[PDB]
Assembly symmetry: C3
Homo-oligomer: 332 residues x 3
């Protein structure tokens, strides 16, 4: 009887940060209550000032990471305020039935709904909007995020021993398809209905104009670089709701990687790069061994360095000359 279970309300945080949770479950199964408010908003996505009409869960691209344990119930109140213009819904890849919830969550502006589902499978999973007939438009306008369903006893390595992260980050990677005129400049539009056919045309090229982390070129750099210290264990959850990606930590590795995100499987060890298929979340665990700047990229390096799919870590601590050193510095 679900009404006999504890309820716990989660207050979500903006990516790449993750709401507080416990890796090993400290209670029995719970109904974990989340609320998200859909926001259609203008977003500047590149250094040139390109502005799109984004479609967001909770004001961010990606939407926030939700965290529960296996066999918890996820109860989401989804709000579509009347200041939005479009119908929206939500599909959880973690859920079973009704198109992941999408068939049960269609909300016009001015409406809300509450969905509950049992998180029966452990892993990281995509969630995304999926309105019938408009699915890729919403997804590729930023309307996607992820949920992590932890095993009740936390993560385990390939031998069944615990893996405990000290920090966790959520990198959502977004492919945008900003319509281009025949000279190659972006078009912007006066209403969503006026934009729809050229959005479809742009999407049908299968060639993103932008591929970004955390909603914009450079979002995970500078004052918003990811951080760690030498010796810290970091889990990086990475999602891509629509298109393949190949994450890579420049100067590091994925020590343990669930490339397709499902924790009942043993992780892949010692990865340089891994393939997260479109429509999937993956997770990589790494223990930092060197300080300095790292780049975290999609290792299609055109996608990374020309289209935007690159962020930074700033890592503090002691340099290990045994692992790496300049024997003779660059010189004539």
């Amino acid at each position: 009887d679900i009404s006999t279970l504890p309820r716990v309300k989660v207050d979500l945080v903006k990516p790449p940060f993750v709401h507080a949770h416990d890796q090993v479950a400290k209670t029995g199964p719970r109904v974990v209550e989340f609320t998200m408010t859909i926001e259609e908003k203008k977003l500047v996505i590149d250094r040139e000032g390109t502005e799109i009409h984004a479609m967001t869960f909770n004001g961010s691209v990606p939407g926030p990471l939700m965290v529960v344990h296996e066999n918890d119930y996820v109860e989401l109140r989804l709000i579509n305020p009347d200041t939005n213009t479009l119908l929206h819904n939500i599909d959880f890849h973690a859920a079973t039935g009704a198109l992941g919830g999408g068939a049960l969550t269609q909300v016009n502006p001015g409406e809300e709904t509450t969905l509950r589902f049992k998180a029966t499978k452990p892993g990281v999973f995509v969630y995304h909007c999926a309105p019938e007939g408009m699915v890729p438009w919403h997804v590729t306008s930023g309307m996607n995020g992820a949920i992590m369903v932890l095993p009740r006893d936390g993560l385990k390595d390939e031998k069944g021993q615990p893996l405990t992260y000290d920090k966790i980050y959520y990198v959502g990677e977004q492919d945008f398809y900003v319509p281009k005129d025949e000279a190659g400049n972006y078009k912007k539009y006066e209403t969503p209905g006026e934009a729809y056919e050229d959005a479809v045309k742009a999407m049908r090229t299968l060639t993103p104009t932008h591929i970004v982390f955390n909603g914009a070129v450079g979002a995970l750099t500078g004052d918003h670089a990811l951080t760690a210290a030498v010796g810290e264990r970091v889990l990086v959850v990475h999602s891509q709701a629509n298109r393949d990606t190949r994450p890579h930590l420049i100067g590091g590795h994925g020590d343990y990687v669930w490339a397709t995100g499902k924790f009942r499987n043993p992780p892949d060890l010692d990865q340089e790069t891994w393939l997260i298929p479109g429509g999937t979340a993956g997770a990589a665990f790494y223990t930092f061994r060197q300080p300095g700047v790292y780049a975290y990229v999609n290792h299609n390096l055109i996608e990374a360095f020309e289209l935007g799919a690159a962020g930074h870590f700033k890592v503090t601590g002691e340099w290990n000359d045994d692992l790496m050193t300049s024997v003779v510095k660059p010189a004539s």
Copy 2:
């Protein structure tokens, strides 16, 4: 001595259905006899009426699924009737030697041939036509299918326990490259020789115009939706002879997935989405837990919903409100 082995003749069926077979082998090794007749034919591939000249095994895109057991011999009579115009052959990825059989099976119109090979490795595998100098044209004109080589003791899970499917379906996914003029409309052609250079040009864009299941937009929908019942165990074999895909069951999972199709490996568990590389067949096993409509898609959602890579399941049975429920239906 192969002549001392039983022979069994298989009568193939049209995808997505699969000819009758036994998961666990009920006999010793056999020579399993198949016949396929090549058919070049016009096919309408989309709702707009776009018509291509398809190149088929047995009249369908994809060609039919062949099913044998490990260490059976596959003996294929391949017929190229004189009503066709082109040379064709067949390459089995399941086979060893002679370019998978392609070097031994070149048939002009009016010819036939019989190839035998030993199915030494268990898995699902692509087969496709591959005429020297014309390989991607034939493949991307629909001339590909798959073969399943079951272990003699049937499928097993990651722990070595049996997995027994109640139903099996074969989804062949086809990328087409219909030539476009500079305004973007399709060109159609008066002979295959007149079409060849612009087919090559279209292919070299690496951008399909259409990506379809079972040969056309919407083929696996409506009266031709896939079906199941709650509690049934379903294996979905999925092939892509030329280009990566990322299957996903909307509202479900791959409970056990051989993403690259080879049954000696343990399956991946609990997948949301999986990557089947171009040139591969994969297989996913799922036990349905909820009734209703599901979409089965390539989770590049542009490829699915704009280019055609989407089908449906219609599932009968009882709804489980513990797994999912609408707590508060959409309302103001």
Copy 3:
């Protein structure tokens, strides 16, 4: 104390050949000394005579395969002669810290540097140039190779039993983005600075003009086909520094495949085709069972047969009619 370790100097060879080494380490950990000299040079990459300005390690595309054992130190002297025009560096995906070495190895023309790193993880790994702000241009101009870090006790199968190769080859796969004018012909350029914006434009299409093995269409064919004999065990290391590939041996298999290249993981068995993500090296082990010609391809068959990603093996020995035979040769 690293100065107490043996030093061994390796003399590299041109791909697809691999410098001599021992699978099982015959000594304790060593400092393995390599020297590479950067060469910017014109290269003809296709049958039409298309000429690019390649950026190479040691004069080849790909750069040579380096081979060490786990817990050896790699000490690379990297030389940028004053006959080159650009700044270069090197990033080893095998290494930890300083962007894989790139932050420590920036050499102007007329400079050299020596980097040392500890090869702490076994596998095959990409290395590539990565000058800040110019990364994909250098990589997609050919400035990438691979390093193999063998386990000290050599390779093992999924059950922990030895796998010993008789031959090894290194196939580097290169995506080139030769700029095209609006009629589709290649542009060539008078200086690298004059080429840079249109290189970026070409790259941003995400559509290679050429995808080649060993630096050119047809490089691994004819007198330069790969060779083997029936019964020989062959390891094929395959890298792609920038873009996904899907290798396939036509007429064979990957008997044991590390698709993402990391030897602590059990290999995948019996693969037809496997996905090597951009930014990764993979390795496939096969024992030849039939003589004749094989094609080794990227199984996007457009990429293989139209864009260049195809090579050949020529295999000597006895034909096995039990594995495959023509029962009835093509005839009316």
